[PDB]
Amino acid sequence: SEQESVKEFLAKAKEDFLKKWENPAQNTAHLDQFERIKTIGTGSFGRVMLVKHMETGNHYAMKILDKQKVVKLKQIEHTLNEKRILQAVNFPFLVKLEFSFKDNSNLYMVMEYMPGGDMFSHLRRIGRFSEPHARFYAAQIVLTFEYLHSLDLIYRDLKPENLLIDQQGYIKVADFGFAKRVKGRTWTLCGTPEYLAPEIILSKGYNKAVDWWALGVLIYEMAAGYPPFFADQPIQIYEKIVSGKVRFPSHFSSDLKDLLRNLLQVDLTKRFGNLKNGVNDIKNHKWFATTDWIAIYQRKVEAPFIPKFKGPGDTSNFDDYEEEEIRVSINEKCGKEFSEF
């Protein structure tokens, strides 16, 4: 009857999601309501700033997207997906979109601020995580993917760079740039090279199974300290991914290796998460036998690593980036393209 409680939790979560999916929150703040403090991150799409909402004094991470760059990069549809989805979802290991708005030049997404840093920085410093440490994080992603997939969402960008550590040592998935709501197959080449399932590389038409492959990549990297498929250039990584070979460090437990062989499975009829038992082939695997799935959800397990608190607006867990100034044009750009934002 564990399974019946999960079903009804998920049915209730779908009614909650669909209301917001159908009637999206829109224009819920303005730039002028925020004091900009420091640039705390950038990707190849825009830039993220620590801001302070002046009316409440709360700190947030504000993603700024230049509409003209989104259009030139052909990321219109993905950006509409990203915001529509993130404003609709509600799960403990998903970063919260607090406000969104746009002006003549930019789109803005204001999310909860996580001063503890990304998993990526902690992993590189420490080298690798212990099996128990990796398992605590992996558990949160298993639940998160069970949630997302139940809403017909594919995530498509799992990696330590997209996982932030909150003040209890739990994680939040924090970038929804390539998330999509789709029934059936989708075809876009997207993701991060090290994490791409073979059916993406091969232009084959794919589904949520790509997320579970990616979870295998994450668990491997967390526990080894390096990815299962690495090379100096992407085409060399793809050749390795599509070969069907993986080698495991000698310190990997036999249960870990068996899990990973089932997730890093080129054969879609055999990949864990994509069989008739679904996510339960994972949650019941021997590597997960000590994981109390409900206690993880409720955040009652003691975290293996709590980042040291230094203030709600401290930025010492992020690198320094060059400051650039936000320029807002007196003419509206790309109005029609982003009307639903």
Partner: peptide, 20 residues
């Protein structure tokens, strides 16, 4: 060691997603 190969490689920093 494989780990020494990784940390000397071209892709140890934050990795971007792929485009178009």
């Amino acid at each position: 060691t494989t780990y020494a190969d990784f940390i000397a490689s071209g892709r140890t920093g934050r990795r971007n997603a792929i485009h178009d």
